[PDB]
Structure 1
Amino acid sequence: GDRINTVRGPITISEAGFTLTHEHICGSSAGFLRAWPEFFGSRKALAEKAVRGLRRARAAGVRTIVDVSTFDLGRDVSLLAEVSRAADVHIVAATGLWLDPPLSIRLRSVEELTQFFLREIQYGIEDTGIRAGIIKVAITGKVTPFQELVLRAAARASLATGVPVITHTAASQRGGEQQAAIFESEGLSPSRVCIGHSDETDDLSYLTALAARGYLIGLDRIPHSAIGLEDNASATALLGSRSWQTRALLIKALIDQGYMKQILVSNDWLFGISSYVTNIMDVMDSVNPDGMAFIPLRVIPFLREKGIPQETLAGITVTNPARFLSPTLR
């Protein structure tokens, strides 16, 4: 209603403050952090880096992050709770599915996946009593048959709980349209849906069209634009070629179209990553040493220079996430 579930329990809407709506403590795989913590140096080393990173974001104004790591991204909510306490930053946990479901998940029906997402929202994650405050889904291309199952289960869990849905759009193929078609077929309100990674395209008319329909637009990979690395071929399939200012101008463009209320902004950062080639974390930290503080330290000042008023920036970073996350069936 007016309360959001975090890994430290419920908080009221006003407590959320400046919120980054798409982040990760660790990008991994189910079971991996507990089976092979030394991959990250140690669990303690990962925890400590994440606490410093969160404290840095906090000093830059951030009060809440949404960790949209799912089961199959190796989400460890006990780790989230630990670093949230030590850094005094709220963390909202996620249910849903990313792009690496194991057999025990890939073989499930839409009704089974609905029950899974529901248990993580209504009951808790694993045996921790920590409840998810968001549902995350991922698609590739035009949306695969299994991904459509996931999208429908997500819609149904959202409809039962009021908790919103956030998507990973991995396509050069105006990937939102097919997502929206499926969500709407299920009776889900666009206002419960963020179409994420929308800063991956320059297709403004496409983004504006979604915004006009009531979808939230996730401009949430701003620092992955990067710059400089064409020597590592596996650094263009995780970063990019456009500049971060180019991505950030999409924020101004949507504002100018009159859809400031539809925008969510984030870094899609993390403090550890195992679901990619070894040492990619070091490359990422080199390119973006600001980490999760990139949005408040770089993008916000950049927008202010481009004439975006304080109140509009506060609306995007405080009010929109608050309205989005607050569980709602209207």
Structure 2
Amino acid sequence: MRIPLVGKDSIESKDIGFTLIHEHLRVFSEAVRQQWPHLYNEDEELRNAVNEVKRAMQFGVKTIVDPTVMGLGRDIRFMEKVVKATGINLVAGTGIYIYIDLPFYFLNRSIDEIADLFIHDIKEGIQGTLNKAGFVKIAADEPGITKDVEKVIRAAAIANKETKVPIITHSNAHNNTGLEQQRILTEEGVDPGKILIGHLGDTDNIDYIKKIADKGSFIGLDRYGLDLFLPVDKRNETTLRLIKDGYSDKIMISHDYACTIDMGTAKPEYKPKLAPRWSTTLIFEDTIPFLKRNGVNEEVIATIFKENPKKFFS
């Protein structure tokens, strides 16, 4: 009993099993949903999330880590409903997802006050329940490391030092944000092995990805199916390359699938190859078979999906 689970007793990290480290049951903008509930259907969202999780479990997924936090519409009671319907081990997190500035609430507030919110969710529970957070999620993207983005990073480091939960990040693979997150966190005393630098699979710049892995953090090849960021074939070649080059013990793989997401849909792009179905199981249908074909053995798969998450949460 060391990793808290939604709707269940906590488990030992050694028992996490086959894990999807970055998937979302549901994402929404809190303010839009509060103000215009007519745009949403929680029953449909629930059905969709339950079906996705069930499909993941039939491929052998034991645990799903869901980094939906403030800014992405975290709802612990929705998450509980999915657990009740499926029996999945679900790890919820705390944190703040922003690209530029914090909400107005945080005007005249300290990094310590921010960290206290995270620690509340880890030690006391999330949204008035006894379901506790098992990691912290932070973000940076195109705007880079702004002052408020940096405040949140520093607050995450405080929470990690106090509670030992790991940190998952969102970064932009093309502007060094991930490298900066890793640097700031490690400067503040976070173990590099307690950090997953996200969305590195969005680039085929292997020198950049290795640089981060070499500094001791997990690398998030974590958006399989999101072709608009990087097509599955190029992701697969990069993943294969990294495996070939000895990086299995730093690689984490996921889809960043949002079973439902409320953002406007971007212009389709059509390529010669039929578009992969983005879902929580695309890796079982495409990536893993591809790897196996190219001689990747079962031990690599176990390393990426079992041993790495076990270490991350240890």
TM-score in terms of structure 2 length: 0.90
CA distance in structure 1 between the aligned counterparts of 2:20 and 2:33, rounded to whole angstroms: 24
Measure the CA separation in 1 of the matches of 2:107 and 2:240. 39
2:305 paired residue number: 317
Answer yes or no: is 1:121 the counterpart of 2:122. Answer: yes
- Asked whether the equivalents of residues 225 and 277 of structure 2 are also in contact (C-alpha less than 8 Å), the reply is no
1:212-251 correspondence runs (5 A): 212-225=214-227, 239-240=228-229, 242-251=230-239
Do residues 270 (structure 1) and 271 (structure 2) align? no
> Which residue of 1 is the match for residue 57 of structure 2?
58
Give deviations 1:230-282, integer Å, cap 9, x for gaps. xxxxxxxxx33x420211222222222222111111000012112x11x67x9
SS of corresponding position for 1:116: helix
Name the CA shift for 1:202/1:253 in 2 (closer, same or farther; >3 Å). same
Alpha-carbon distance between aligned partners in 2 of 1:106 and 1:21, rounded to the nearest angstrom: 33
For 2:46 and 2:174, locate their aligned partners in 1 and report how far apart those are by CA, in whole Å.
Answer: 35
Tell which deviates more after alignment, 76-85 or 244-253: 244-253
Residues 1:19 and 2:19 aligned together: yes
Matched, 1:299 2:299: no
Measured after TM superposition, the shift of residue 18 of structure 1 is 1.1
The aligned counterpart of 2:94 is: 95
2:185: which partner in 1? 183
- Structure 1 residues 168-226: Cα deviation after superposition (integer angstroms, max 9, x where no partner): 0125113222112211220111001011100111111121121111111011012102x
Moved more, 157-166 or 256-265: 256-265
Other-structure match for 1:3: 2
Larger CA deviation: 290-299 vs 310-319: 290-299
* Contact 2:257–2:280 (8 Å) recurs in 1: yes
Q: AA paired with 1:19? A: T
The alpha-carbon distance between structure 1 residues 219 and 128, as it changes in their structure 2 partners (threshold 3 A), is same
Which SS does the other structure have where 1:22 is aligned? coil
SS at match of 1:23: coil
CA distance in 1, matches of 2:61, 2:217: 24
Q: Distance in 2 between matches of 1:288 and 1:134?
A: 30
Shift of 1:288: 4.9
Relative to structure 1, the CA distance from residue 58 to residue 146 in structure 2 (aligned partners, 3 Å threshold; closer, same or farther) is: same
- Residue 152 (structure 2) aligned to one of 119, 129, 150: 150
2:115 is aligned with what amino acid?
T
What is the deviation of 1:137?
0.3
The 3-state SS of whatever aligns with 1:129 is coil
Aligned length: 306
Shift of 1:309: 0.3
Q: Which runs of 5+ in 1 are unaligned?
A: 226-238
More helix as a share of residues: 1
SS in 2 for 1:128: coil
Contact 2:68 2:93 (C-alpha < 8 Å) held by counterparts: yes
Q: Percent identity?
A: 34
Letter aligned with residue 89 of structure 2: H
User: Hey, what's the Cα distance between the residues in 2 that align with 1:79 and 1:25?
Assistant: 9
Letter aligned with residue 62 of structure 1:
V
Correspondence 1:209 to 2:211: yes
Question: Does the 8 Å CA contact 2:64/2:89 hold for their aligned counterparts?
Answer: yes
Pick from 239, 242, 246 the counterpart of residue 258 of structure 1.
246
Task: Tell me the CA shift for residue 71 of structure 1.
Answer: 1.8
Q: Secondary structure at the match of 1:222?
A: coil
1:193 aligns with 2:181: no
- Cα 1:88–1:31 change in 2 (3 A) is farther
In angstroms, what is the RMSD of aligned CA positions? 2.2
Question: For 1:180 and 1:290, how far apart are their aligned partners in 2?
Answer: 28
| 1:123-163 Cα distance to aligned partner (Å, 9 max, x none) | 11111111111111001243111111100000110111110
Q: CA deviation at 1:63?
A: 1.5
- Change in CA separation of 1:97 and 1:182 when aligned onto 2, cut-off 3 Å: same
Whether the 8 Å CA contact 1:219–1:264 is kept in 2: the answer is: yes
Deviates more, 1:29-38 or 1:189-198: 29-38
C-alpha separation in 2, matches of 1:91 and 1:222: 20
Question: SS of 1:136's equivalent?
Answer: strand
SS of equivalent to 2:20: strand
Equivalent residue number for residue 29 of structure 2: 29
| Structure 2 portions without partners, runs of 5+ | none
